[PDB]
């Protein structure tokens with residue numbers, strides 16, 4: 001449990017952009033397409049592809065972020081929110097500077 005939380009923290013530290021996703025979730029597909037359009041290749045973790053570990057990671061995500069929905073987006077190691085939250089930062093002109101500060105590749 002503490003190791004899993006640590007693993008999540010490491011994951012978001014190791015990758016400029018992390019998207020905790022489900023393959024079937026339209027909002028996740030939508031935020032993935034935004035990143036594609038901004039020439040960013042995020043680390044995508046598909047919770048529905050991880051079997052028993054999926055709900056365990058979600059428990060950690062709710063504790064760390066206050067969010068129970070997917071996609072759960074992190075940039076530069078910081079929680080962003082979901083698809084609508086990410087798109088808000090985009091419209092506000094804040095997302096691209098965050099991506100460059102996070103050293104997002106591509």
Ligand SMILES: *SC[C@H](NC(=O)CC[C@H](N)C(=O)O)C(=O)NCC(=O)O
Nearest residue numbers: 025026027068069070071082083084
């Ligand atoms: S597609 C699966 C669901 N995702 C959302 O409803 C995300 C909505 C946010 N506004 C966003 O990311 O844009 C989901 O995670 N449902 C699970 C639940 O408990 O409702």
